[PDB]
Every structure is written in structure tokens, then in C-alpha cells.
Design a protein around this ligand. Structure first.
Ligand SMILES: [Cl-]
Ligand SMILES: [Cl-]
Ligand SMILES: [Cl-]
Ligand code: NA
Ligand code: NA
Length: 196
């Protein structure tokens, strides 16, 4: 199964289909797809777990990657059985997701806490509890509570996209720390990122 706080499972949250692929709510998919390319991990169809998944070596560690194919608000229907079957404890899971409470170009690593309104996390925390790690990829504030769907299901303007892309790139360079269990150092180095 998993082994302490070495990260062994990296999940990216998002919605399936070309119409959602460029939307802010797919920030987690962006991160995990780029990480998979970086390390040569194949992401293949995983019908048993309602997702796309892979497994491979990251810096000498066996790591699994998962993109739920359930739609965002049903993400737990992939993450939970996957983690149960492979016996991966929450403490060894990193979930990458868009974060409305942070600016584009801000990125943070958090351990624990609630969903913060995120409809994918809301489908996961009830089942595995809160003690997994999160890569919170800022996507900017939506304005009103009424603009929140239109914000997360929007394609960001190019300046915001550039800021997100640079933050994601920075985080990719710190995955080595995470798979090695160096969560405190990773937190310090991720959270210190500035775009400019
Ligand atoms: Cl959604
Ligand atoms: Cl945080
Ligand atoms: Cl979070
Ligand atoms: Na976008
Ligand atoms: Na550390």
C-alpha cells in the first residue's frame, strides 16, 4: 500500500470532455497531465475506477496518478474505490485542484482542512476524511456567489492563464520533494512562489 507521508497517489480534479478541458475547474487535470508527461507515466483508460490512471517511477518512488472521469461533483466515485483497492492512506494522497480563494499565479500545498466550497473535494472528504494533501492552484476570485459557475467553467484570459501555467510549472519541479516525504520543505518552497 502506501508508506507514511511519501506521496504515492496524485489525483487531478476536473471534468471530462473537450468542452471542459481549458476551463479553470480543470486546473488539477492540467497539473497531473503535465506531471505524467514529465516523468513518462502513461495515463490510460481505467474503467474499473471511472477514471484515467497511470503508474510509474517518479524519482525512485512508485507513484499512481488518477484523473476521475465522473464529472467533478462525483469525483469521490473514482478516488475512494481507487484508494481503497490499492490500500493508499489519505496521508499519502495529493489532490491537485483549482482554488477560488487564491489569485492566478498563487499556488499552495495544504494538509487537511475542508473543501472550501469546491464541489469535487466535497465528494471526497466525507469518505476518506480531510487528512490528504492538496495542491491549491489559484484561479482567482469569481466576484459574486452568483458568478461562481461561470467563473470555474470559464476559460481564463491569457494573462491569467500564463500566471497559472507558471505556478503549475513551479509545482512540477517540487514533486520530487513530495514523493520523498519532504512535505514541510515542499510546502515552504511551493508556497513561496511568486509569478514576477
Ligand atoms: Cl463542475
Ligand atoms: Cl494553504
Ligand atoms: Cl484544499
Ligand atoms: Na482557463
Ligand atoms: Na521536509
Amino acid at each position: 500500500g502506501s508508506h507514511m507521508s511519501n506521496i504515492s497517489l496524485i489525483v487531478g480534479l476536473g471534468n471530462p470532455g473537450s468542452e471542459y478541458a481549458q476551463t479553470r475547474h480543470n486546473a488539477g487535470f492540467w497539473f497531473v497531465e503535465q506531471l505524467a508527461d514529465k516523468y513518462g507515466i502513461t495515463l490510460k483508460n481505467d474503467p474499473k475506477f471511472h477514471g484515467i490512471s497511470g503508474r510509474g517511477n517518479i524519482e525512485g518512488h512508485d507513484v499512481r496518478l488518477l484523473l476521475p472521469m465522473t464529472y467533478m461533483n462525483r469525483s469521490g466515485q473514482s478516488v475512494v474505490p481507487f484508494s481503497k483497492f490499492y490500500q493508499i492512506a489519505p496521508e499519502a494522497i495529493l489532490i491537485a485542484h483549482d482554488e477560488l480563494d487564491m489569485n492566478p499565479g498563487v499556488i499552495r500545498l495544504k494538509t487537511g482542512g475542508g473543501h472550501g466550497g469546491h464541489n469535487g473535494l466535497r465528494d471526497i472528504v466525507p469518505h476518506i476524511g480531510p487528512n490528504f494533501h492538496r495542491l491549491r492552484i489559484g484561479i482567482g476570485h469569481p466576484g459574486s456567489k452568483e458568478r461562481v459557475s461561470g467563473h470555474v467553467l470559464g476559460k481564463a484570459p491569457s494573462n491569467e492563464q500564463s500566471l497559472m501555467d507558471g505556478a503549475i510549472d513551479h509545482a512540477l519541479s517540487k514533486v520530487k520533494l513530495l514523493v520523498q516525504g519532504q512535505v514541510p520543505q515542499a510546502m515552504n518552497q511551493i508556497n513561496a512562489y511568486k509569478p514576477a
